[PDB]
Symmetry: D2
Subunit: 476 residues, 4 copies
């Protein structure tokens, strides 16, 4: 852009070239001109006096956009669309007086935004699908690896690394379905006139409603949409922007939860992000391993959540057939939501492709904590061997207190099993202690739940996206 | 009691049926119902629970000592265990098989899902009624010209009915969203402390099939088709985002609609209903309340977004108190807005002569091109006509803005001999009905193709007055 | 209330009786009647024909509120203020036609809300001051106790338990100042008439501006405010609600950060919130130690942050001299913000009074991690003893990698010091290793920063609140 | 380049001054300035840094190879180290003393605080100008009657100037808030990796006094009166909440004002200097300002211990956009306020339509109710049921019952006499509250 002015970090640091391009002025104004060509083409076929020469001029000059002239004209007219009409007309002097014929500014403005929304959603969907697929592979691989469960972030009944990963995956699958739904539900604005009544076109076609309806259908079809709104004011209802940014906000929340979990696992030393060979962690310590990619995801996911309040507020105060207090806001929030989303999905894909697990750290933490969770199982085995529940409970309470004192008052390892092994009272069950403290037998149905979840819910969703799976996600 | 804070959602606004769904009676009755279903299903699958124990629990589902549960919660600092001990006091033989194998969320989360489903089922008919009443209004007024507004400045005419379709369309998107979310809800079922069902697997001595059947049995008794396969301790809090998103979106629609109605009241084109002994001056107070409450609905979406985003691992308890507030308030607020909006839509008054007057003020400026074209068709030169119309329009604009007068552009054209070829046409060239484009057809097409198909499922709940 | 309808958990579970009472209908409608009395009193003094009998009727019946009648009248009139005028007039038949004389509904509605906001802020301030004082005591006590620093939640240069506690305290001190500022900046609406012009009162006093200004001054003073707005529409500007709920949202953010830290320290086993003797953690495991109070604080702090969007949106669409789309929203968000805030501060005070530290767990974690952070100091001691910087660096890099592998690849304890002890190359510094790994010497200026911060910034702020310091914070849940 | 996304805040809206303050040139020049100040102060306190090294750094503050820094950031994945190595490349003699003892936030956070203060200093005069222009308008129109609106329905008359004071008062609250926040900003200073200054304490061989002086010296060179005593790695992110709160509040004020102006444009009573497009843009951007407050609230609330990096990317976006949006709104609002157009005859006409209904009580009192109730109902029916002008006065004029007051009807319906104390309130408000605030600017 130029380092002497503000540049959005979404453009200069974060988002992919593809998404940056979709929200560029080239893409936008090229699409405006495309829409003016389609209007002229359709109008000519329906019988307005537009010559093939005029159409040919416009077709030749679609990419030939003098941005300097349009800026100068916008300065003079204070109207972006008319600046581009006059600028396109300068290029195309024979076609000049039939460009924009019958239309209001939103014919190009709103229809271009809808085309952009659809294309932007189409870039996110494969990226999200890739993330889900990579995590699903990880989940399958680690379906049966026991790990300490956490509720209130305190030690809890064991889960597996893969099962925990399915918590993440499930949230993303709900996003995938939401994004798909919203993408398929988008309708074209079409040709509607200044207040949505098509009065201008009805006059041009001298009272022929059928021709007005066909014009709407023709441009809708050329733009690649199955359906147009029947009802609009000047604009498509800004409720559409709420629907889109809601599903992105929800996705942000999922990503934030996942990346927060990953950051905590990094503190625990159970799991880590990928690391580049020459990557530095800190100014003081290059070897320090910070989960910086996950941190960035959270940071940007938060912005995605924040942004939902823009279109909510905007839609809620749109007066009658349109007010222009939506316009500047939308220039910002629509682009930034998609660029932020794009960034988080590229980054999350990158993280999921390089996740490192440390099984021996996981095991160590289980050995520390499992003895306290297994006291009930040891009492029951003692009862089965002919002991009284109350005696066994008082004896386990005393040995657990000795062990708890070593942990908390002395900073030592949990030795509760070695204490039970060395007490004659528990000699009826000493031979069973290997069985009663097997971590795999404390994981419930975790590995089965993973298997069932991947077959029944995940793989069916992913099957449509096979062809986009081989792309690797790089970062700078 | 007026000596403590009472939520105005209970004391002023929401219907008794929505208030009841979020009551402690409803909640704790459902907890006990869920404990009965667990014991019933556990007994069938072969755990040593006696018919006497089950009979005790069945007898005492409604018999809730709230005072004792509060006292017990004070002692234990645990709401679910307080209700276990309290239910056990009632049912001394069954005490000690209540909650067997379950974690607290077995009653907590499953009850919230039952509540969400029932709350959505109350909103849906109300929203359908609102849409139906507005659709009736739209049909009735499909062809009534009214001044269009963009930038809230005079624009190409629309119709009262067509404008009403803007409102209706937004609400129809909400209706579909609410239905979707309602149908997508899954039961949590029986999952254990961390979602692995380890406790139940131990009770059934390693039999996975029995664990899966227990989950299926309680899910079915609760009236759900499907349970989650994957959970931690809780159902994913993403569900709360889905629900409160569609309510926030609805809030935004309602706010737009009620804002339009308030503006129409200033214009004197349309008014709310009025009681005979109502005290103000005619204020659109119901629409104002709708906006006020819709705003809160929009605000509330940030609660579940924030909550879900910081849920660590298999669950943290920092969701709980927040959810006690935002879930109930979202539904009670939504309920209130829909009842109130239905009431407004049933009594909308239109003033066609005020509408007409405003059209007469503004239409002459929008009709200048049509008058020039009629002059050209009658043998005028177009440049002459354009310069003459420009001068008379400027005189008329000056009378409107600089003198506060009525637009007299037509009387100026009538009194100029130059325009005598078209004086007889002036009634035709300024007919408001002919400036409305395809508005009335758009209404007709929209009601047949999009609105009536949505409403057909809700016929039986249509006759209720708000 | 009644268990057959929805009851706000802010009333039934969380907030103190004092805060619940300030937002009660009794408090509100009593204050309406008080304001009508003050108006009549002041109007009589300034010469309107209001009799002492009429004033006496009103004075007798301030607390004597027939809620059933007011509800019935509100049903009929659809106007809460007029319902209460007619209801007050029914018990005061002689005064009936001079109640509300010259005033618009906001004379009671808005002025009562301002009185409530001021009194609600006055309940929060001492609670926040107590929290800061309890944390300050903890900070002083633990000013010198080394603990592992965390950035990115990864091991970092050591801090102290007390210094970390000052991070918490500083945020709350910024809240204290904000709450005080907003509390002191509140102005009374006073008597302004329907559109803020006082036209009604100017007519009653037959053109005498001086009397209108005195009436405004008199009721303002009776309500205990130093200043009234000069400029209003029908209402006080709703920007005031933004100012108040902003500082509460900010406070929510501080509390959430603090309680999040405490929850993480509980996982680390370095610090815990208090526990009752008969408290249960889980229905599966009674002994499991959940930081449930901190979790509730976070949960409620979040709601406080969420609520800031209500008054922002409300103020931004108030048309002209007032629209009524503020009213229902304000009934909810003002009360809930204060009740939520009250709850969080009581609960946080309770937590701060019972914080337990486990120094041996803290020490153990330092022993695990400090060797990696102390490599530079060991190299420098080797250089000073006549070794080459590059040789020492290559040797320490290899032993650190062996030690890191034992930690991560083998799940072992950090043995880097035992590796350095067993390498002959480092024999010039083996005797120094106690000195070079002393945790106290890695804490920089932490304990001094605490001391300076408590003397210069904290204690000066607390001095005004001495007399309310001895109150203990109880929880029923 | 039109082939990538460009923020409209840069390409359409904000002033060059504000754009520049949030540019990468300004940022990385400030990083280098802070490294120079650190070296200067460190040398004075006795660390072995030569005058030549300091001179190299001073020469090359503006001389930033962005291409090299980007390449280095690609390799290292660390923005600050990339700029250390890049600054060291152009300053080979100084290379090994740059960043000595400091953590990355020494440049990152202190630069943001310098930026916040400079950005606030650009907004303050603009806001003061807006208030001054509106105050002029208010004084000029203090006595001009206009219809009051509550529920946007006709209400007791106010004046154009008095209504303008509603707007002004909100902006004055913003002015005070912005000033307060600007003056209360504290410098982070030199604090080390976790806020303990351990690194500096080691460099100065145990001398606390020298560490405290270093902190004081860089704080003074940056132009701040006060530094934090207490930090973690960062300045507390509560500061970002304080700043964006006052901007969100300002957004709300601007949105209210511009919403009022848009409604007055529909009424044809007041216009911008057809469509109130500038006011519409203000509202649109004000909304974004309000939205943004949730970013720093969320960010601060989940900052773990002595810092987590999940604040960083968010802050790159929201801090800049809040100030650029605010700047735009204030420039635009100033432009609007410089030549607001009033149409007194439209205002008068609307008063003539509505005043007769509000003046019924005054006519009854002059007579001293069922007769006025019946004629008002006839007149209301002509207005609403027939779309006619209010003829209540002509009905009273034509009824013999009211012949005792027919001559008084001009007096009893004079709009100026229905405005209460509006013009006095304006005068008192401008003298006592507004002008004292403006005098500093
Ligand atoms: O086709 C029309 O122009 C009809 C017109 N409605 C408009 N529709 C679309 N664009 C319009 C409209 N009006 C203005 N503008 C121009 O949009 C631009 C707004 O710029 P910004 O606020 O920065 O987003 C800015 O360039 C504005 O001039 C109406 O009166 O209904
Ligand atoms: O261990 C520690 O406490 C590290 C300590 N903390 C950090 N402070 C400041 N910046 C850091 C820090 N850490 C990383 N980074 C780098 O910040 C950059 C973040 O990039 P982005 O997320 O896109 O905004 C990105 O370039 C990051 O590499 C330090 O002095 O370096
Ligand atoms: N894992 C859990 N699941 C459900 N409830 C719990 C759990 N742990 C504690 N509780 C209780 O849930 C209630 C939460 O209260 P609150 O924080 O007010 O919503 C308290 O009574 C807690 O003791
Ligand atoms: N201008 C006004 N000022 C204060 N209260 C009003 C006004 N107009 C109507 N009210 C009453 O205030 C109450 C608002 O109710 P709600 O919208 O539920 O808060 C209703 O009883 C209204 O009739
Ligand atoms: O004082 C009231 O009740 C109403 C005032 C209004 O309509 O503005
Ligand atoms: O109370 C429970 O059932 C669970 C608590 C926990 O997960 O610790
Ligand atoms: Cl169009
Ligand atoms: Cl379990
Ligand atoms: Cl369960
Ligand atoms: Cl008043
Ligand atoms: Cl340091
Ligand atoms: Cl530093």
């Amino acid at each position: 852009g130029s380092p002497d002015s503000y540049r959005s970090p979404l453009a200069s640091r974060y988002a992919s070239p593809e998404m940056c391009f979709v929200f560029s002025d080239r893409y936008k104004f090229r699409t405006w001109r495309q829409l003016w060509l389609w209007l002229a083409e359709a109008e000519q076929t329906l019988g307005l006096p537009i010559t093939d020469e005029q159409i040919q001029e416009m077709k030749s000059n679609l990419e030939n956009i003098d941005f300097k002239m349009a800026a100068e004209e916008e300065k003079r007219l204070r109207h972006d669309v008319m600046a581009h009409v006059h600028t396109f007309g300068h290029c195309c002097p024979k076609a000049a007086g039939i460009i924009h014929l019958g239309a209001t500014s939103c014919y190009v403005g709103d229809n271009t935004d809808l085309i952009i929304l659809r294309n932007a959603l189409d870039l996110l969907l494969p990226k999200l699908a890739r993330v889900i697929s990579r995590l699903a592979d990880f989940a399958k691989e680690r379906a049966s690896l026991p790990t300490l469960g956490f509720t209130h972030f305190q030690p809890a009944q064991l889960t597996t690394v893969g099962k925990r990963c399915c918590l993440w995956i499930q949230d993303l699958c709900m996003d995938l379905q939401n994004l798909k739904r919203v993408r398929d539900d988008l309708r074209f604005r079409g040709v509607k006139g200044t207040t949505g009544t098509q009065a201008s076109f009805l006059q041009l076609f001298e009272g022929d409603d059928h021709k007005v309806e066909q014009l709407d259908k023709m441009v809708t079809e050329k733009a690649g949409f199955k359906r147009a709104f029947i009802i609009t004011g000047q604009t498509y209802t800004r409720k559409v922007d709420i629907e889109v940014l809601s599903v992105l906000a929800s996705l942000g929340a999922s990503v934030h939860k996942i990346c927060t979990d990953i950051r905590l696992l990094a503190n625990l030393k159970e799991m880590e992000e990928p690391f580049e060979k020459q990557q530095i962690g800190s100014s003081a310590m290059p070897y320090k391993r910070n989960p910086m990619r996950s941190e960035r995801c959270c940071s940007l996911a938060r912005h995605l959540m924040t942004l939902v309040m823009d279109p909510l507020q905007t839609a809620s105060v749109q007066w009658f057939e349109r007010t222009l207090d939506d316009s500047a806001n939308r220039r910002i929030c629509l682009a930034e939501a998609f660029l932020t989303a794009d960034t988080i999905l590229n980054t999350l894909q990158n993280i999921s492709e390089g996740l490192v697990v440390y099984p021996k750290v996981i095991e160590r933490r289980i050995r520390q904590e499992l003895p306290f969770m297994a006291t009930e199982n040891i009492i029951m085995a003692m009862v089965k061997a002919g002991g009284s529940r109350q005696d066994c409970h008082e004896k386990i309470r005393v040995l657990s207190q000795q062990a708890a004192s070593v942990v908390k008052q002395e900073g030592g390892d949990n030795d509760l099993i070695e204490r039970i092994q060395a007490d004659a009272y528990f000699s009826p069950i000493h031979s069973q202690l290997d069985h009663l403290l097997d971590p795999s037998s404390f994981t419930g149905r975790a590995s089965q739940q993973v298997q069932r979840f991947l077959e029944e819910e995940v793989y069916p969703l992913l099957k449509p996206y096979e062809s986009v799976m081989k792309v690797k996600a790089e970062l700078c």
